[PDB]
Structure 1
Amino acid sequence: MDSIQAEEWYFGKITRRESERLLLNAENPRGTFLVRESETTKGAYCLSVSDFDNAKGLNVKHYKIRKLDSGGFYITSRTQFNSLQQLVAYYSKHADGLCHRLTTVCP
């Protein structure tokens, strides 16, 4: 009954202030992420994540999701997938040199 337009990590087109406000939520664990729609880029997507540190608190790392002109995506040239979910799974298993392994999603 669900679809790519309503996944556990799909919110739609949100604003920028609300973006850092959803991941910076002090009530969020380190590793939460979300897949919003392109806002300051082409009609692609944007996978943001959350991180913590003993420097000041918790910040947010925005990882723009690339889009292959053929019909796919790849935040990096070494990671291409044919489904926003597939890319969300790889990052949700091996940071592959990322800042953290995707584990939670935006509430």
Structure 2
Amino acid sequence: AEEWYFGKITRRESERLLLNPENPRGTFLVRESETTKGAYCLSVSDFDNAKGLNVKHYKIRKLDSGGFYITSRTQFSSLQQLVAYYSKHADGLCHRLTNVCPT
């Protein structure tokens, strides 16, 4: 669904964008991984009543057999199917995906 695909942005910049106080918990973006070539990253804003605003990063790996996954047991045939899925069920993530990060 493209608006949430931010491509080549750094971890630092994704955190700057996501840690905007006005974003609801579960605001997210998908970007390329800086450190693991060929992997993507799902970056999500989260709240802890201790840490407060913070961002969790979930590496999205590509199976050679083709699929995408964050945890081994749940694989997806595309990034857009993975985003639709975690927008409905948190299923291991800190929180379900809610808003697409602005811009």
Shared fold by TM > 0.5? yes
User: Within 2, Cα distance between the matches of 1:17 and 1:96?
Assistant: 26
TM-score (norm 1): 0.87
User: How high is the sequence identity, in percent, across the aligned residues?
Assistant: 97
Deviation string 1:56-82 (CA, Å, 9 cap, x unpaired) is: 421000001011011121001111011
> Given that residues 18 and 27 in structure 2 are in contact (C-alpha distance below 8 angstroms), is that contact kept between their aligned partners in structure 1?
yes
Count of residue correspondences: 102
Distance 1:80 1:36 in 2: 18
Deviation at 1:91, TM superposition (A): 0.7
How many Å apart are 1:20 and its aligned residue? 1.1
Moved over 2 A (4+): none
Are 2:24 and 2:98, in contact at CA under 8 Å, matched by a contact in 1? no
Give, in whole Å, the separation in 1 of the partners of 2:51 and 2:33: 29
Which residues of structure 2 form unaligned runs of 5+? Answer: none
Shift of the alpha carbon at 1:42?
A: 2.0
RMSD of aligned alpha carbons: 1.4
Distance change in 2, residues 1:96/1:16 (3 Å): closer
Q: What is the match of residue 41 of structure 2?
A: 46
